Amino acid sequence: LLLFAGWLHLQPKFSPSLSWFKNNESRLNHHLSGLFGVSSLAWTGHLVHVAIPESRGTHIGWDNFLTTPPHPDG
Amino acid sequence: KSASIPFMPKPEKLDGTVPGDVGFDPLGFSNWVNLDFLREAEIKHGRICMLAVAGWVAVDLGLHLPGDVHNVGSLEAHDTAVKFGAMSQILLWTSIFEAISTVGVVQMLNGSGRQPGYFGFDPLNFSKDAASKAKLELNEIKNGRLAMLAFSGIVTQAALGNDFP
Amino acid sequence: FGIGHNMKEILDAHRPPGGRLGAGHRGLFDTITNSLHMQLGLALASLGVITSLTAQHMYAISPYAFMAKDFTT
Amino acid sequence: TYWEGKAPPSKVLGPVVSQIPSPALGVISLICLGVGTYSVHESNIFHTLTADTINPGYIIGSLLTPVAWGTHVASWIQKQN
Amino acid sequence: MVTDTQVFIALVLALISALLAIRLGTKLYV
Amino acid sequence: MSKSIPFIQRPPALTGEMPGDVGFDPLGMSENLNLGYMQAAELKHCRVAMLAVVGVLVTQFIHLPADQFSATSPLDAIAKVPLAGHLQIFGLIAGLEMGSLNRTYDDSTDAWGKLIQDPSGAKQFAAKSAADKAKSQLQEIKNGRLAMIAIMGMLIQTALFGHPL
Ligand code: CLA
Ligand code: CLA
Prior knowledge:
It is classed as photosynthesis. The entry lists the keywords Photosystem I, Xanthophyceae, Tribonema minus, photosynthesis. This is part of a larger assembly, with 2 copies of chain A, 1 copy of chain B, 1 copy of chain D, 1 copy of chain E and 1 copy of chain F. Chain A is mainly α. Chain A has helices spanning 2-8, 18-21, 24-55. Bound molecules: chlorophyll A (2 copies).
């Protein structure tokens, strides 16, 4: 997917304009809240849903992670 | 020079053109913030409080349907509606509307020119039909202010017993 | 969206009145945004500090189960 | 917003703060500092913080201290002129 | 315990990715 | 402006040439995204979603004679059909998409010219008048934009509450 995206963003109609690259404010906002924060939120979600139950002997996987809440109170 | 408080000079930024103007800015809040933002906040608070007062009275007197009927007094309604999920739904929809209103108000304060507390919501066209919508706008603001005070009261009164008046 | 900080103003505004920093940070916004080498160097330096920090902290504060007994790793 | 002299222009404070007179900012900063210090002292200094002692009010008050510093700087900037 | 089918489909997806890499590089255009 | 949202300025980038345009973009994404590709993607989503809705609704009452085709809910159905059939349909769709590839990423053609066209349907559209062309295009866009939310709600309801109803 990333290789395809790299090819795609070299097409004339998809190549981002120069002003887009130098949009410092939006880049910082997204790469802080999105790339760092949401990513960390997703990782802690993984730890709560998968890592911790797996460490406590409970098998959580894609086939059963939607019906077994990580905490009994939920 | 102010109609409400004659000790203070006529507050700046309150030209009198705005409906409901009684020149009441004793702490000079209007000078601090862009006036249209404050007007939108006032109108939104007033509308929400009108709805809240009507809901409080109606719930205290009448109840919708089973489950909703069991809870009775509005004090123990936030909890119950949380339990059976109504609060989540209304939160979701109000959040969607508010999120769109974010860009709506961002357009304002930037020169878009949207009237404070203005949307396209006039299905019956009361103000659209009437050239003199000033009466309607003033009435909305005043009844909303009364609703704000009344809801504040009702809540702080029922939180201390006092049964129902 | 109206709300937020504009970084050029921040950089231009931080010039102590004592004058010990001269013109302060005036003109740094343009140099950083227009120069890829400066921001590349900043990113490389921060990444190097973080790599050193990971090296220093993983050994002292073991994050992985049963590591610190696999000495070679 | 580059400024020389001894006091920055009010526009550095932003659209809202720049319009607030100095005494208002001073009183607000004093209130904020008092509340923040009192909150930070009540929990974790005068009382040990536990799992079941997390008061949201004290957290907000503690966060209010940097607001107090910012408001006191803004009050000085407004005072110089 | 990965079966031969798993290895084969991994190889197929790797071949697709390799072709995409070929095309991307070609498009970087020397 | 912005017929769809009365209180937001009409998004600058978009203009009526695109069928289904009502100036809805509140986030101003239209100024950053290739609108031709976005229109093509939206149209493909519309057609896929409409087919999915009709399929789930028809399947909800009758099925093919085979027992393993007798699954009642969409999710149980995907779980029950053997892998061979899924691979077969996927291969058909993959062939169609690979055929579509070269035409999709052009820029001298409209969205309807990008997605593969049924020769009978394309000929019928070409024989149609320009006004009727636009009318039919708008019809398709709107019916499909309803069908997308329809299918999303359908699948979410099936997953959460058992049956898609
Ligand atoms: C939420 C939205 C979002 C997201 C997710 C991203 C994400 C990304 N952007 Mg994009 N970008 C955005 C919005 C976003 N951007 C916007 C709005 C703009 C317009 C201004 C741009 C403009 C832009 C440009 C111009 C470029 C990117 C690039 C990148 C990539 C940076 C390289 C990388 O792999 O990250 C690294 C990701 C991390 C999570 C690492 C975090 C760093 C810390 C130090 C690591 C620590 C992690 C942990 C503690 C270590 C343990 C892990 C270990 C056990 C494995 C990344 C995929 C660059 C790129 O490579 O393009 C493909 C690039 O050139 N972006
Ligand atoms: C992170 C690694 C990396 C990346 C992203 C790039 C990226 C780039 N390089 Mg640089 N380069 C690198 C490493 C890298 N290079 C190294 C290590 C060297 C040697 C020191 C060079 C030397 C170099 C030169 C001399 C030039 C570039 C050029 C380029 C550009 C396009 C080249 C291209 O793909 O054309 C198309 C190439 C291909 C499509 C070939 C792809 C290779 C395929 C995937 C190999 C697959 C074989 C497979 C493993 C076989 C297994 C079979 C098995 C079953 C037996 C692009 C900017 C050119 C450029 O743009 O200059 C401005 C250029 O002139 N590079």
